[PDB]
């Protein structure tokens, strides 16, 4: 099992 | 059994 | 960005 | 994006 | 028995 | 991309 | 900027 | 980019 | 498991 | 069994 | 930048 | 098992 999550809400 | 899921709602 | 993979296969 | 595969075959 | 799976949703 | 092969043959 | 990765795969 | 391969073949 | 988080609200 | 996963969301 | 590889193959 | 992760948010 493998899970990747990325988000960019950077200032 | 194999399951792949991907979604891109990135900001 | 979400990527998920799961596998259960005899090897 | 969803991809699913399942198999039960004697080998 | 042999199973191959590949996916490219790369950023 | 999915490739599956299974075989049960006496040899 | 958030990056997350988790994996549980026998090796 | 995901690549998966599994095999169970007597040798 | 791996988690990375970065933010820049610097003055 | 072999699993490869790569992602590039680098800043 | 994320690169993951796992393998369990008798040798 | 091998995991590589790199990020550059340097000032």
PDB file of C-alpha atoms in Angstrom:
ATOM      1  CA  UNK A   1       0.000   0.000   0.000  1.00  0.00           C
ATOM      2  CA  UNK A   2       1.261   3.448  -0.970  1.00  0.00           C
ATOM      3  CA  UNK A   3      -0.281   6.877  -0.532  1.00  0.00           C
ATOM      4  CA  UNK A   4       1.036  10.193  -1.829  1.00  0.00           C
ATOM      5  CA  UNK A   5      -0.539  13.573  -1.156  1.00  0.00           C
ATOM      6  CA  UNK A   6       0.732  17.035  -2.046  1.00  0.00           C
ATOM      7  CA  UNK A   7      -0.776  20.483  -1.852  1.00  0.00           C
ATOM      8  CA  UNK A   8       0.604  23.931  -2.412  1.00  0.00           C
ATOM      9  CA  UNK A   9      -1.236  26.781  -0.743  1.00  0.00           C
ATOM     10  CA  UNK A  10       2.007  28.561   0.134  1.00  0.00           C
ATOM     11  CA  UNK A  11       2.333  32.314   0.639  1.00  0.00           C
TER      12      UNK A  11
ATOM     13  CA  UNK B   1      -6.030  -7.599  -6.488  1.00  0.00           C
ATOM     14  CA  UNK B   2      -4.769  -4.151  -7.458  1.00  0.00           C
ATOM     15  CA  UNK B   3      -6.310  -0.722  -7.020  1.00  0.00           C
ATOM     16  CA  UNK B   4      -4.993   2.595  -8.317  1.00  0.00           C
ATOM     17  CA  UNK B   5      -6.569   5.974  -7.643  1.00  0.00           C
ATOM     18  CA  UNK B   6      -5.298   9.436  -8.533  1.00  0.00           C
ATOM     19  CA  UNK B   7      -6.806  12.884  -8.339  1.00  0.00           C
ATOM     20  CA  UNK B   8      -5.426  16.332  -8.899  1.00  0.00           C
ATOM     21  CA  UNK B   9      -7.265  19.182  -7.231  1.00  0.00           C
ATOM     22  CA  UNK B  10      -4.023  20.962  -6.353  1.00  0.00           C
ATOM     23  CA  UNK B  11      -3.697  24.715  -5.848  1.00  0.00           C
TER      24      UNK B  11
ATOM     25  CA  UNK C   1      -2.455  15.941  -5.769  1.00  0.00           C
ATOM     26  CA  UNK C   2      -3.399  12.463  -4.521  1.00  0.00           C
ATOM     27  CA  UNK C   3      -1.990   9.143  -5.714  1.00  0.00           C
ATOM     28  CA  UNK C   4      -2.985   5.854  -4.117  1.00  0.00           C
ATOM     29  CA  UNK C   5      -1.958   2.319  -4.969  1.00  0.00           C
ATOM     30  CA  UNK C   6      -2.695  -0.926  -3.189  1.00  0.00           C
ATOM     31  CA  UNK C   7      -1.914  -4.458  -4.192  1.00  0.00           C
ATOM     32  CA  UNK C   8      -2.285  -7.925  -2.801  1.00  0.00           C
ATOM     33  CA  UNK C   9      -0.871 -10.411  -5.224  1.00  0.00           C
ATOM     34  CA  UNK C  10       0.929 -13.596  -4.293  1.00  0.00           C
ATOM     35  CA  UNK C  11       4.463 -13.700  -5.587  1.00  0.00           C
TER      36      UNK C  11
ATOM     37  CA  UNK D   1      -8.485   8.342 -12.257  1.00  0.00           C
ATOM     38  CA  UNK D   2      -9.428   4.864 -11.009  1.00  0.00           C
ATOM     39  CA  UNK D   3      -8.019   1.544 -12.202  1.00  0.00           C
ATOM     40  CA  UNK D   4      -9.015  -1.745 -10.604  1.00  0.00           C
ATOM     41  CA  UNK D   5      -7.988  -5.280 -11.457  1.00  0.00           C
ATOM     42  CA  UNK D   6      -8.725  -8.525  -9.676  1.00  0.00           C
ATOM     43  CA  UNK D   7      -7.943 -12.057 -10.680  1.00  0.00           C
ATOM     44  CA  UNK D   8      -8.315 -15.524  -9.289  1.00  0.00           C
ATOM     45  CA  UNK D   9      -6.901 -18.010 -11.711  1.00  0.00           C
ATOM     46  CA  UNK D  10      -5.100 -21.195 -10.780  1.00  0.00           C
ATOM     47  CA  UNK D  11      -1.567 -21.299 -12.074  1.00  0.00           C
TER      48      UNK D  11
ATOM     49  CA  UNK E   1       1.222 -15.970 -12.824  1.00  0.00           C
ATOM     50  CA  UNK E   2       2.483 -12.523 -13.795  1.00  0.00           C
ATOM     51  CA  UNK E   3       0.941  -9.093 -13.357  1.00  0.00           C
ATOM     52  CA  UNK E   4       2.259  -5.777 -14.653  1.00  0.00           C
ATOM     53  CA  UNK E   5       0.683  -2.397 -13.980  1.00  0.00           C
ATOM     54  CA  UNK E   6       1.954   1.065 -14.870  1.00  0.00           C
ATOM     55  CA  UNK E   7       0.446   4.513 -14.676  1.00  0.00           C
ATOM     56  CA  UNK E   8       1.826   7.961 -15.236  1.00  0.00           C
ATOM     57  CA  UNK E   9      -0.014  10.811 -13.567  1.00  0.00           C
ATOM     58  CA  UNK E  10       3.229  12.591 -12.690  1.00  0.00           C
ATOM     59  CA  UNK E  11       3.555  16.344 -12.185  1.00  0.00           C
TER      60      UNK E  11
ATOM     61  CA  UNK F   1      -1.233  -0.029 -18.593  1.00  0.00           C
ATOM     62  CA  UNK F   2      -2.176  -3.507 -17.346  1.00  0.00           C
ATOM     63  CA  UNK F   3      -0.768  -6.827 -18.538  1.00  0.00           C
ATOM     64  CA  UNK F   4      -1.763 -10.116 -16.941  1.00  0.00           C
ATOM     65  CA  UNK F   5      -0.736 -13.651 -17.793  1.00  0.00           C
ATOM     66  CA  UNK F   6      -1.473 -16.896 -16.013  1.00  0.00           C
ATOM     67  CA  UNK F   7      -0.692 -20.428 -17.017  1.00  0.00           C
ATOM     68  CA  UNK F   8      -1.063 -23.895 -15.625  1.00  0.00           C
ATOM     69  CA  UNK F   9       0.351 -26.381 -18.048  1.00  0.00           C
ATOM     70  CA  UNK F  10       2.151 -29.566 -17.117  1.00  0.00           C
ATOM     71  CA  UNK F  11       5.685 -29.671 -18.411  1.00  0.00           C
TER      72      UNK F  11
ATOM     73  CA  UNK G   1       3.574  23.540   0.718  1.00  0.00           C
ATOM     74  CA  UNK G   2       2.631  20.062   1.966  1.00  0.00           C
ATOM     75  CA  UNK G   3       4.040  16.742   0.774  1.00  0.00           C
ATOM     76  CA  UNK G   4       3.045  13.453   2.371  1.00  0.00           C
ATOM     77  CA  UNK G   5       4.072   9.918   1.518  1.00  0.00           C
ATOM     78  CA  UNK G   6       3.335   6.673   3.299  1.00  0.00           C
ATOM     79  CA  UNK G   7       4.116   3.141   2.295  1.00  0.00           C
ATOM     80  CA  UNK G   8       3.745  -0.326   3.686  1.00  0.00           C
ATOM     81  CA  UNK G   9       5.159  -2.812   1.264  1.00  0.00           C
ATOM     82  CA  UNK G  10       6.959  -5.997   2.195  1.00  0.00           C
ATOM     83  CA  UNK G  11      10.492  -6.102   0.901  1.00  0.00           C
TER      84      UNK G  11
ATOM     85  CA  UNK H   1       4.796   7.570 -12.106  1.00  0.00           C
ATOM     86  CA  UNK H   2       3.853   4.092 -10.858  1.00  0.00           C
ATOM     87  CA  UNK H   3       5.262   0.772 -12.051  1.00  0.00           C
ATOM     88  CA  UNK H   4       4.267  -2.517 -10.453  1.00  0.00           C
ATOM     89  CA  UNK H   5       5.294  -6.052 -11.306  1.00  0.00           C
ATOM     90  CA  UNK H   6       4.557  -9.297  -9.525  1.00  0.00           C
ATOM     91  CA  UNK H   7       5.338 -12.829 -10.529  1.00  0.00           C
ATOM     92  CA  UNK H   8       4.967 -16.296  -9.138  1.00  0.00           C
ATOM     93  CA  UNK H   9       6.381 -18.782 -11.560  1.00  0.00           C
ATOM     94  CA  UNK H  10       8.181 -21.967 -10.629  1.00  0.00           C
ATOM     95  CA  UNK H  11      11.714 -22.072 -11.923  1.00  0.00           C
TER      96      UNK H  11
ATOM     97  CA  UNK I   1       6.030   7.599   6.488  1.00  0.00           C
ATOM     98  CA  UNK I   2       7.291  11.046   5.517  1.00  0.00           C
ATOM     99  CA  UNK I   3       5.749  14.476   5.955  1.00  0.00           C
ATOM    100  CA  UNK I   4       7.066  17.792   4.658  1.00  0.00           C
ATOM    101  CA  UNK I   5       5.490  21.172   5.332  1.00  0.00           C
ATOM    102  CA  UNK I   6       6.762  24.634   4.442  1.00  0.00           C
ATOM    103  CA  UNK I   7       5.254  28.082   4.636  1.00  0.00           C
ATOM    104  CA  UNK I   8       6.634  31.530   4.076  1.00  0.00           C
ATOM    105  CA  UNK I   9       4.794  34.380   5.745  1.00  0.00           C
ATOM    106  CA  UNK I  10       8.036  36.160   6.622  1.00  0.00           C
ATOM    107  CA  UNK I  11       8.362  39.913   7.127  1.00  0.00           C
TER     108      UNK I  11
ATOM    109  CA  UNK J   1       7.252  -8.371  -6.337  1.00  0.00           C
ATOM    110  CA  UNK J   2       8.513  -4.924  -7.307  1.00  0.00           C
ATOM    111  CA  UNK J   3       6.971  -1.494  -6.869  1.00  0.00           C
ATOM    112  CA  UNK J   4       8.288   1.822  -8.166  1.00  0.00           C
ATOM    113  CA  UNK J   5       6.713   5.202  -7.492  1.00  0.00           C
ATOM    114  CA  UNK J   6       7.984   8.663  -8.382  1.00  0.00           C
ATOM    115  CA  UNK J   7       6.476  12.112  -8.189  1.00  0.00           C
ATOM    116  CA  UNK J   8       7.856  15.560  -8.749  1.00  0.00           C
ATOM    117  CA  UNK J   9       6.016  18.410  -7.080  1.00  0.00           C
ATOM    118  CA  UNK J  10       9.259  20.190  -6.202  1.00  0.00           C
ATOM    119  CA  UNK J  11       9.584  23.943  -5.697  1.00  0.00           C
TER     120      UNK J  11
ATOM    121  CA  UNK K   1      10.826  15.169  -5.618  1.00  0.00           C
ATOM    122  CA  UNK K   2       9.883  11.691  -4.371  1.00  0.00           C
ATOM    123  CA  UNK K   3      11.292   8.371  -5.563  1.00  0.00           C
ATOM    124  CA  UNK K   4      10.297   5.082  -3.966  1.00  0.00           C
ATOM    125  CA  UNK K   5      11.324   1.547  -4.818  1.00  0.00           C
ATOM    126  CA  UNK K   6      10.587  -1.698  -3.038  1.00  0.00           C
ATOM    127  CA  UNK K   7      11.368  -5.230  -4.041  1.00  0.00           C
ATOM    128  CA  UNK K   8      10.996  -8.697  -2.650  1.00  0.00           C
ATOM    129  CA  UNK K   9      12.410 -11.183  -5.073  1.00  0.00           C
ATOM    130  CA  UNK K  10      14.211 -14.368  -4.142  1.00  0.00           C
ATOM    131  CA  UNK K  11      17.744 -14.473  -5.436  1.00  0.00           C
TER     132      UNK K  11
ATOM    133  CA  UNK L   1      13.282  -0.772   0.151  1.00  0.00           C
ATOM    134  CA  UNK L   2      14.543   2.675  -0.819  1.00  0.00           C
ATOM    135  CA  UNK L   3      13.001   6.105  -0.381  1.00  0.00           C
ATOM    136  CA  UNK L   4      14.318   9.421  -1.678  1.00  0.00           C
ATOM    137  CA  UNK L   5      12.742  12.801  -1.005  1.00  0.00           C
ATOM    138  CA  UNK L   6      14.014  16.262  -1.895  1.00  0.00           C
ATOM    139  CA  UNK L   7      12.506  19.711  -1.701  1.00  0.00           C
ATOM    140  CA  UNK L   8      13.885  23.159  -2.261  1.00  0.00           C
ATOM    141  CA  UNK L   9      12.046  26.009  -0.592  1.00  0.00           C
ATOM    142  CA  UNK L  10      15.288  27.789   0.285  1.00  0.00           C
ATOM    143  CA  UNK L  11      15.614  31.542   0.790  1.00  0.00           C
TER     144      UNK L  11
END
